[PDB]
Design a protein around this ligand. Sequence first.
Ligand SMILES: CCCOCCN(C(=O)CCl)c1c(CC)cccc1CC
Length: 264
Amino acid sequence: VQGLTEEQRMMIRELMDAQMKTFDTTFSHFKNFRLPGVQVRKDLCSLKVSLQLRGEDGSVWNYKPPAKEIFSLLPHMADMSTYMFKGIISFAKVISYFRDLPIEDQISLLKGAAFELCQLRFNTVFNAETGTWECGRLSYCLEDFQQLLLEPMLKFHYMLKKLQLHEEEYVLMQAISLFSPDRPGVLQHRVVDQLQEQFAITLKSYIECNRPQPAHRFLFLKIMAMLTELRSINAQHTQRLLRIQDIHPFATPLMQELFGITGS
Ligand SMILES: CCCOCCN(C(=O)CCl)c1c(CC)cccc1CC
């Protein structure tokens, strides 16, 4: 199924192939991470998360948080973030359009979008019926209403999930986010921008060709608005993270590079 030009079909295929090669959807290789042991507030969410690890032998470990000092959870969160960031970096470097950019713009684009592409991937393993991100043998369950939807990042995941996007549309959202001409430090602003417009046109065109239903009217514009919201959620989270890092260091080396922390 198409309706697109051959160059548009190639673009989707190139993105789908990079996603296939760099997204471990069963989180098989996320191993030996840390776990909670046996203006700091006021800017953090009131959302609590419970953790579940299914054992290879069928046993289950379950973690419930106190019922809110979440410092015990940060090293684990830093390790999962780092694992997702590694996937995102591998995603970008397999795309020809990305490789073709100057090294400095690659770093600048990855610094801008790594959070955003990570969330887009986490949305594909989110279960909106049970409030759970299902990451292989690892589950993150939301702790007990619609008061949960007032945390903007949770609302993003629920709203994005309700759109019932195809694999192809998730991977085009990832490309539009990554090829953002107005990220800090971008030099080839015009090249990145024309790439972005092509990915966007392909998405608009894909939607027009393969989603005739009345429920998918304005779907392209809905997706664009969620990408705008994701970008704003990105700035909010970066600043929450740098505040905590200033009181309680937790960012991995890789997170430090992405957030421009230098070690001094
Ligand atoms: C430094 C922790 C940020 O976590 C808040 C953002 N988030 C989610 O909403 C789940 Cl998609 C998420 C979680 C919480 C389950 C764990 C690992 C990775 C991430 C994304 C990077």
